[PDB]
Every structure is written in structure tokens, then in C-alpha cells.
Ligand binder design. Structure first.
Ligand code: A1R
Ligand code: A1R
Ligand code: ZN
Ligand code: ZN
Lengths: 289, 8, 289, 8
């Protein structure tokens, strides 16, 4: 969990402002929007990186290119690649990062309104964030369904097929015969209704608070839609914070006067915020359990 | 609703 | 070694042009300029990434930030961090990538004029590229010297200190008493004379060939100087190629009409070039030895 | 000669 700054440049003052804004507006809550950046310190291998072994088994299995493992048409023509990545990335194989627990702390301090995650590792939930407060926009492995008729399947049936050596004979629907897959959203597929339904009620929640609101965007390159639309769709009068290594998306396209940009690692960012907030006490507790 | 999971 | 494209977009045609230019100018040679990108598939852990264990031991040892491990002043105040990274990154702990061997193939086909590398893993040499043709601009572990008087030390004395548990009592010069370190160039230090001396003779070599020359820049974000000056210092009439995931440096600042940009992984790039060149025969041989 | 190893 140990972290360190990303440059010699200190970011404590910028982080200080965040705590300042929270102290001024005590009865306010925060809306997080995160991505893959917040889970890198957890050891989750990037399938797009030639450094991970996951990437190489994929390359060997003749996958034409990384993102094809999340392509409907490819999965149907050859599901082994996806099954192989599922085996390596299945929930429970990793542990929550310090930033993940920061979300938990916020839930305990009743200052967490919602956390929109585009990650599929489900580390927010695994770290204790309640279901009501989570929006897994790209789905998870917690559910499974037939890609043909939609019948529901217990997540276990898919998981039991992952330990066989080798992996073969995949889960076919016993109603229509098509392949059954985890409730992970693939390119070309739509997101679950709750993504827009929750964003809808959360968009009105924000416009009506203008106890000022605070939306913190962390660890995402904002390159996948429609997820990447939430930021520009933030009430122009609601303060936006960005914790990333590079300034990306709408923060680079149409910067807003009130924008606060913090170039820092998500775990080092968490270390600083919990300091400027003075919650080291409850934090340490959570971290040691 | 946002369209389908994509780029751009 | 197995690789795959980086997007569904094919880059074979662009790579085809490279082979075309080489076929047209048979008596010509190529000048490579590479960086960390060409060694990622080798499993070398990035000290700046919270995903590697190297990063975490550094964070624990209280290193203020990544690049400080290559900072003169910090090393002198506390050398344990650097020694710890040396133990993990020492030459011989890894094997050459397919791109590295591509350089070897070019040396065999007598079409390699020089390879300027900013990496310190020395995988070019380890892969068989001759000393004469290599420019390790940021040094290596092959040599060691006192940071105070400059006395020379066999690389072994430093290396033997890396296996002790724990690592303590470091190599001090037995002449002046200062710390002895590997011939790795640190921020704030200058590069060896041969970098500019060789670039000088190579800059004239290019201007005088205008058997047309071909300079291929691979796997570098061109963010470290003076290394990152070589590209803009390339004869405006000499074709420049860039094999990176992002268009960076001078290729983004002042693009030249004749520039060829290939967004591809260095190993997939190598696979394609050796195909458009028709050297699969000699390649396979090298790879299987 | 290029100065010293740096950024920018
Ligand atoms: N430790 C840490 N802290 C803060 N920001 C970080 C960190 N590590 C990476 N990053 C940043 O987070 C961003 C992560 O981008 P990315 O890997 O593209 O993932 P996403 O969350 O946005 O997207 C998912 C992508 N994964 C598979 C599909 O290929 C998608 O394009 C990127 O812009 C980085 O600058
Ligand atoms: N497999 C592969 N193929 C092609 N390009 C790649 C690959 N992997 C990464 N890259 C690209 O290569 C670049 C590598 O940048 P970087 O990690 O900064 O390393 P350098 O070679 O340029 O520099 C060294 C840095 N390491 C320590 C010091 O912190 C330096 O700033 C980056 O812009 C990427 O888009
Ligand atoms: Zn069905
Ligand atoms: Zn000395």
C-alpha cells in the first residue's frame, strides 16, 4: 500500500483546498467517477501491456488485438481468449487499494453520494462500499446471462469452468444454445439502465444543491463512451476535481475556471486527503482490518 | 441513453 | 515473445513503405533511436508504476518520488533505494525482446549504422549488437566509478553487494572515501563524450548521404534531454519514422511532410517489418538460438 | 554538448 509522490512537486496545497471545500460545506457529499488508474497499485495486469503474462497468452491464443477480448462478435467466434482473461482477472484474486478504502471512509463519514466506476474488478464493493452507492457502468462477474435469449445464470456456473486444464467446452444456454457470459458490458453493447437512471437523479441532485456538492474524477483517461460524458454533463456551477497523471478528457478540452487539477497517484492522493481532513484515526482502523 | 460502449 | 496489433487498424501498409524504402536504397543503413518502450515486453518493472513491487519497496524505503533514485544528491544522502533498484534491474535478470533481435538481424544484413538507446538494461548488447554500433547514452552497469575522485572500479565489486540480506555498508572509494556507483547517468549529470562525438560524425554521415539514409525512432516518449534533441537535429531531407503508441516529441511539435508515423507495439512492428523484408528465414534462426 | 540529463 505504501506510496510516494509522482514528481518532486508537492500537491498537498491543492489537496488542502479539497479538504477546505469540504470543511466549509459540512453537510455536503461527494460524487466519485473512477477508472483503471485506481486499481493499478493492486497488481491487476493490464491486458493491453506486453509486460503482463495475460497479454502474451492472449497473443498466443491468436487474439487479433487487446480490446477484441471484449468484442461480442469475437467472443462468439472464439471465447477461449475471454475465458482466459476471466481466469486471471476474476474478482477475489486481488485486494483493495488505499484509495478504494478512502471511498469506504467517506461512506462512514456519510459524505459519499455515489461512486461511478468503469472498472470491472469490483474492488469498491469488495472494500465495503454499499451496493446502493455503487454504479458499475461496465458490469461485473456477479451476474451471468445468455447472449441469445437472456436467461439468467448463477455466476458460479461460469466460474467453475475457469479451473479446468485446459479450458474447453464453454457454458452454453440450455434454452436456446447460445454462449452464456458474465454481466460485463462489451464494446458495441449498451450499459445497464441504472447507469443513466442514476445519473439522471444525480444530475438533478447536483443542480438542486447549488452544503455545496463536490465531484471528484479519479484514475480515468476518459476515452470510453458513454462513461466519458458525465464530466462535461456536470453542472457548470459545481466544482470539478481531477486526480490523474495527465490532464485528460473534458478537463483538457474545455477547462472550467473553477477546475482543480491534481497530478498525483490515486494512493498518494488518498494519503494526503485523509491528512488534510484529519481522519487518519478512522483511516488507520479501516486499513488494519 | 449514451449509445453503445465505444470510443469517440 | 508472441505479440498482437494495438488496435483493429492494420499498420502493415505503413510498415510496407519502410521495406519499400529499404529495397529502393539497398546500399543504405538505418539509425535507430530507442527508449523504454522496446523493453516492456521483457518484463522489466517500471519503478514509476504502483503496479510493480519495485515501486513499493522504494516507497517503503521513503524515497520521496520515483526519479529521485537517479538523483546525485539523494543517492549521497541515502543510497539504499538505488541499491535496491539495482538488485531488481541488474543486467542478466531479463532476456532480449523480438525487437532487440531485429537490431541483430539488421547488423547481420549490414544495414545497421547505429542504435542510440536511452535504456540502461543493455539488452541490445546482450542480444548480440556489437559495441561499435551501440550508444548507451545514459550509461550502464558495465562500469563503476567513484563519484568523488573518479577512480575506476570493476563492476563486480558493486554487484557482490547486491545479494546481501539486508543490503548495508555500501561501496566506498578507498582513495577519497566517497560512494562508488555504476556508470549510469543520473539527472543533473552529463552524458559520456561518445554520445555527442558519435552523433557529430553521424550527423555529418547523414547530411552527406543525401542509398538514402533512414532513421527509425522507437519506444521513447522523447521527454528526457539532451537525448530528445537528436530527432529535431535530423537532416530535414532524411526520412524519419516513428514507432510509438502515441505521437510524441518533435513528431508532434513540428511534423515534417515526409514523416511516417506507426502506432504499434515495438514487437508487433518487428514482426511486420521482417515480413515485408522477407527475412523471416534468418530471423527465425536468430530467435531459436 | 546537450547540457545535463533533464526534462525540458
Ligand atoms: N496510480 C494512478 N493514479 C492516478 N491516475 C493513474 C494511475 N495509473 C494510471 N493513471 C491514469 O489513469 C488513466 C487510466 O487509463 P486507462 O488505462 O485507459 O483506463 P480507463 O479507466 O480509462 O479505461 C479502460 C480501458 N481499459 C480497457 C479498455 O481498453 C479501455 O479503453 C490514464 O489516463 C493515466 O494517466
Ligand atoms: N511495446 C511498446 N511499443 C512501442 N511504444 C511503447 C511500448 N510501450 C510503451 N511505449 C511508448 O514508449 C514511450 C515510453 O516512455 P517512457 O516510459 O517515459 O520512457 P523513456 O524511454 O522515454 O524514458 C525514460 C524515463 N524512464 C525513467 C525516467 O523516468 C524517464 O523519464 C511512451 O511514450 C509510450 O507511448
Ligand atoms: Zn438462451
Ligand atoms: Zn574516490
Amino acid at each position: 500500500m505504501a506510496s510516494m509522490s509522482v514528481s518532486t512537486a508537492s500537491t498537498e496545497m491543492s489537496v488542502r483546498k479539497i479538504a477546505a471545500h469540504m470543511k466549509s460545506n459540512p453537510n455536503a457529499k461527494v460524487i466519485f467517477m473512477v477508472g483503471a488508474g485506481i486499481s493499478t497499485s493492486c497488481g491487476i495486469p493490464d491486458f493491453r501491456s506486453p509486460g503482463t503474462g495475460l497479454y502474451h497468452n492472449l497473443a498466443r491464443l491468436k487474439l487479433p488485438y487487446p480490446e477484441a477480448v471484449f468484442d461480442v462478435d469475437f467472443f462468439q467466434s472464439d471465447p477461449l481468449p475471454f475465458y482466459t482473461l476471466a481466469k486471471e482477472l476474476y474478482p477475489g484474486n486481488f485486494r483493495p487499494s488505499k484509495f478504494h478504502y478512502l471511498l469506504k471512509l467517506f461512506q462512514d463519514k456519510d459524505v459519499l453520494k455515489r461512486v461511478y466506476t468503469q472498472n470491472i474488478d469490483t474492488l469498491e464493493r469488495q472494500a465495503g462500499v454499499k451496493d446502493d452507492l455503487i454504479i458499475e457502468a461496465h458490469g461485473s462477474f456477479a451476474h451471468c446471462h445468455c447472449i441469445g435469449c437472456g436467461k439468467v445464470y448463477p455466476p458460479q456456473v461460469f466460474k467453475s469452468k475457469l479451473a479446468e486444464h485446459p479450458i474447453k467446452d464453454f457454458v452454453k444456454c440450455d434454452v436456446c444454445g447460445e454462449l452464456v457470459k458474465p454481466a460485463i458490458v462489451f464494446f458495441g453493447e449498451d450499459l445497464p439502465d441504472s447507469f443513466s437512471e442514476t445519473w439522471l437523479n444525480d444530475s438533478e441532485w447536483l443542480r438542486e444543491k447549488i452544503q455545496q456538492p463536490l465531484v471528484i474524477v479519479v484514475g480515468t483517461s476518459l476515452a470510453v463512451y458513454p462513461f466519458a460524458s458525465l464530466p462535461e454533463e456536470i453542472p457548470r456551477k459545481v466544482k470539478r476535481v481531477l486526480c490523474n497523471l495527465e490532464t485528460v478528457g473534458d478537463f483538457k478540452a474545455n477547462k472550467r475556471p473553477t477546475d482543480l487539477i491534481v497530478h498525483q497517484y490515486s494512493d498518494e492522493f488518498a494519503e494526503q486527503l485523509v491528512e488534510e481532513l484529519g481522519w487518519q484515526e478512522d483511516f488507520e482502523k479501516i486499513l488494519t482490518a | 441513453k449514451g449509445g453503445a460502449k465505444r470510443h469517440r
